[PDB]
Each structure stands twice: as C-alpha cells, then as structure tokens.
C-alpha cells in the first residue's frame, strides 16, 4: 500500500496542556496552534491534532504510541522517573513502575490521555 | 538517533471489524489483521490504526493522504450512497483536494491529496 | 528513517512527449504542467517532474513498481505498440523480460530515449 | 491491484560514494549500500536513489520531505557548515530559506538537492 496517515485528531480535556507536555517530553519544538487544534508533528509525515473535549477522553487499553531511539528512551524515561510520572509496563496499566522488553527493545506506558513510548 | 515517529494509535469504534473492513476496502489496503482485542490497519508511513470495540464527533477525524488518481477512484466509489462533506465539521454536504465521510461505526475520516505545487 | 523522496526532476529531450507517453502507458491521468515541468504523480507520495534538456546513460533508468495484473497489461501494450524492450538495464538482451528476485521486470525507452523500467 | 509507484531512480553524479555518504549523513539515513555500479540510498516512502558515477543543471533537483524539527536541525548544520544555500530552485536567492519551508543546496558531487516541509 501507498496510503499514508497524514493527521489524526485526539480528544483531550486540555489541548494546550497535552501538546506542550508531549512536545517537551519528546524533545519536539513548541506545538503550533491552528483553529481548534494544537498540532504535534512527528517525523513520519504525520501529526497529532489535539482538541479540547469535556467528555470521556481515553480508556485503556487505548493509547497513542511513539517509536523512539533507545538513547531517546533512556532520556525520556529518566524525566518520567524524575518528575514523578506514573508509568506501567503494559497497556492495561496493571504493572506500575516497570518497563517492558517486548521486541528486545524497551517500552513504557504513561499518562489523562494514554501514551506509549517504544524502541 | 532516529527522530520521533507516531507508530500506532488505538481508535475506539462501536464495531472494530466493520470499521476495519470498510477502511481497508475503501483505501485499497490489505485485509485487517486481528491482534488481541484489536483490528489492525497498517499505513505506508510506518503508522498503524488499531480499532477496538467501544460503546467520533466532529471535527475529529483521521485523514489519509493519497494520489489524485486514487482520490478520484475512491471518491468515485464514495457510484455510491456514502454521505460525504467537504469540511471537517460536516456542514458542507469535496473541497489539494479533500473530502470527509464516515465509516460504518461513525468514525470520521478524510481523504486528501497533496500534489506537487500544492 | 522517516525521510521521504517528495519529488525529483528528470531531464528528457521532450518533457511533454515523455510525460504524456509515460502517463498513458502507466494508466495515469493526463500530466499536469507546473512551472517548467510536466508532472507525473505516482502513488507513493512522490512525483516525477520532467524537464526539457537522453537525460540518461545506461544502465541509468527510472523504475516503476506495479501490480502483476498491470504488468501483464502494460507489457502487452509494449509489444502491441512495437516499443523496443530489454530484460536488462544495459539493454543487451532485446525482446524479452526477466523473472528475477521473485518478480518480473522489463526495460524500455520513452519517446525521448529515456531509460525506463517496470517491475513487480 | 496496487497503484503505480516510483520504486527507484538512478542519479548520475561525479562521485557516487561522496554523494551517497553525504546524503545519508545529512538526512540521517543508514549507510549507503553498494550494488554493482550504484550506491543505494533508501527513502521511507518505498523509493530508492541509486547513485552512479558520471565524470546538475538548475532548476533540476531531488527534494526531501522532512518534519519542521528535522528541517531546523539539517539547516542549522548547513548554516554552521558553510555549505551555501538558496531559497529558490533557480538559485537566485542565495543564503536564504523560503517560506511550508524549503531550502536548496548542492552535495559534494554538485548534485542539486532540496529539503522541504509540509506541516499540517
Ligand atoms: Fe493555545
Ligand atoms: Fe491517543
Ligand atoms: Fe501500543
Ligand atoms: Fe548517540
Ligand atoms: Fe519509521
Ligand atoms: Fe479517527
Ligand atoms: Fe483533516
Ligand atoms: Fe508522505
Ligand atoms: Fe530516469
Ligand atoms: Fe532498476
Ligand atoms: Fe499475471
Ligand atoms: Fe484485477
Ligand atoms: Fe510501495
Ligand atoms: Fe537529483
Ligand atoms: Fe522542489
């Protein structure tokens, strides 16, 4: 296939709080705001468009997952395990304080939108 | 030292199988793969949608980039009774080019082109 | 990596003959003219921008990935049109296709003499 | 029944090794592969550039789509490295990026390149 996912809208309680937190943690530039969206651009020709929503939001095992460097993981995990960010090895948030080693890589789930970083 | 990528996202829909089959069918993608509670669709830019059964409101949507030729083909099929709108808020029942529509679960989608010089 | 090839400019003796011929054979819509270029858009988020300037030294070539069904169609049109074709990038094996590497391939000329390839 | 894709194109340059290593380094790609007379660079959208020795004429170029963060990184090193650049494909606006965003410059072999963004 050639079709690409170009952008996807993510509903969260506070779009500005979500986007800046993720850009900071992921080491990305300041998010750009356009209309009702806070835009987080990723490297693979895709952006996440955060939008304010009062309702549900995210339920496990739902999540958004970011593929990163293992050098990036050790830094991001350090800040997670520095700034007191609750985290889990699993998408169901049943294993707090652990990382997984799924594909011989490393991975961790965190944050109220559900996130995942993986190598 | 790679730059950060969005690798996959889980999308909650009333019917993950209806959603996945319609999306793979319409976009020309291979048959969805079943993995745990998810129906998984792979896109070309190293990112996956994982549909999961649950219970979208506009202007939420997921948007797929295609060539103009694929846009004309897919929209030709959308020869079809699929409701469609030019805008993410579904107030204009097309607008590069783009068009918005719903899948059988009510999940909001968009197809769009980005031609040279766009 | 995530970096994509978004467009590339291809030098040909006649940009509109090359673009029109290639769009027709490949089953694509009529090429669009943009600035100094005749544009051939392909499906994988990349376009070929033909420009007047040959443009090619063998084994130089531009290669298109296509369906098995479309390969049979296009190659039939290649023989139906009397278009010269070769199994190899060096144009040393005229009149045949190859079946290398789990697929099929054939090399041919556009009207500018530019070296082309279709492959499955 | 896939739609037609551009799978690879071979690029004539003065030095295939200089061009390919330069391009992979700057774009953050893996080490180029050597295959016959070619140095092969794979891009993410299912297309490869195959560099070949030939011992660029504006406005021809190959254009690379990257994120805004990757653009600022690559251009900063272009700025720190004195590589010389232009805002335009005809190279009439030197020392400037354009505004997505774009910047044009050459590689060691003189191959014409471009990095570009297309943000939401
Ligand atoms: Fe704001
Ligand atoms: Fe999410
Ligand atoms: Fe995941
Ligand atoms: Fe390092
Ligand atoms: Fe990737
Ligand atoms: Fe969606
Ligand atoms: Fe959209
Ligand atoms: Fe793309
Ligand atoms: Fe060529
Ligand atoms: Fe080839
Ligand atoms: Fe066949
Ligand atoms: Fe068929
Ligand atoms: Fe492909
Ligand atoms: Fe080039
Ligand atoms: Fe360009």
- Tell me which residue in D3, D68, D72 faces A2 most closely, judged by beta carbons: D3
B111 touches chain C (CB under 8 A): no
Cα(C27) to centroid(ligand 12), Å? 14
DSSP state of D80: H
Bridge partners of residue C34, in order along the sequence: C37
Domain carrying residue D81: 1-120
Which tokens go with D18? 């200089």
User: Is D29–C3 a contact, with Cβ atoms under 8 angstroms apart?
Assistant: yes
Q: What is the resolution of this structure in A?
A: 1.8
Beta strands in chain D (DSSP E): 5-13, 33-35, 38-43, 47-53, 62-65, 102-106, 112-116
Q: Phi and psi of C19, rounded to 5°?
A: -65, -45
Q: CB of C59 within 8 A of CB of D10?
A: yes
Nearest CA in chain D to A28: D69
C9 touches chain B (CB under 8 A): no
Q: How many Å apart are CA D22 and CA D34, to the nearest integer?
A: 15
Q: How many Å apart are CA D46 and CA A62, to the nearest integer?
A: 29
Q: CB of D115 within 8 A of CB of D75?
A: yes
Q: Phi and psi of D95, rounded to 5°?
A: 65, 20
User: Is D6–C59 a contact, with Cβ atoms under 8 angstroms apart?
Assistant: no
Q: Identify from B1, B9, B51 which residue to disrupt to test chain A contact, counting A C-beta atoms within 10 A and taking the largest count.
A: B9
Q: Distance between the two ends of chain D, CA-based, in angstroms?
A: 30
How many folded domains does chain A comprise?
Answer: 1
Neighbours of A44 (CB within 10 A): 26
Which tokens go with C120? 């499955």
Residues in chain C with CB shorter than 8 Å from the CB of D7 are: 63-65, 119
Cα(B88) to centroid(ligand 7), Å? 6
The closest of C24, B67, C30, D65 to C39, measured between CA atoms, is C30
Cα(A33) to centroid(ligand 1), Å? 6
How is the beta sheet containing B5-13 ordered, strand by strand? A87-88, A107-110, A115-118, A64-67, B5-13, B47-53, B38-43, B33-35
B37 touches chain C (CB under 8 A): no
C43 touches chain A (CB under 8 A): yes
Query: How many CA within 13 A on the CB side of residue C75?
Result: 23
Cα(C64) to centroid(ligand 11), Å? 17
Q: How many Å apart are CA D112 and CA D78, to the nearest integer?
A: 14
Sign of the C-alpha dihedral, residues A84, A90, A95, A97? Answer: negative
| Burial readout C50-71 (b: 16 or more C-beta within 10 A, e: otherwise) | bbeeebbeebbbbbbbbeeebb
Instruction: State the virtual CA torsion across A61, A67, A68, A70 in degrees, nearest 10.
Output: 70
Pairing mode, if any, of strands B5-13 and B47-53?
Answer: parallel
Q: What determination technique applies here?
A: X-ray
Neighbours of A67 (CB within 10 A): 24
User: Residue B68, annotated ligand binder?
Assistant: no
Q: What does B36-97 look like in DSSP terms, one character per residue?
A: TTEEEEEETTTEEEEEEE----TT--EEEE--HHHHHHHHHH------EESSTTS-------
B59 Cα distance to chain centroid = 14
């Amino acid at each position: 296939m050639a079709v690409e996912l170009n952008h996807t809208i993510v509903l969260v309680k506070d779009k500005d709080a979500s986007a800046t937190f993720m850009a900071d943690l992921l080491g990305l530039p300041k998010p750009k705001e356009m209309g009702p969206f806070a835009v987080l651009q990723l490297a693979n020709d895709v952006s996440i468009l955060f939008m304010d929503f009062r309702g549900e939001g995210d339920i496990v095992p739902g999540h958004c997952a970011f593929l990163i460097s293992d050098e990036e993981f050790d830094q991001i995990f350090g800040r997670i395990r520095e700034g007191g960010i609750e985290h889990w090895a699993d998408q169901y948030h049943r294993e707090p304080g652990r990382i997984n080693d799924r594909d011989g890589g490393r991975g961790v789930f965190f944050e109220g939108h559900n996130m995942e970083i993986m190598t």
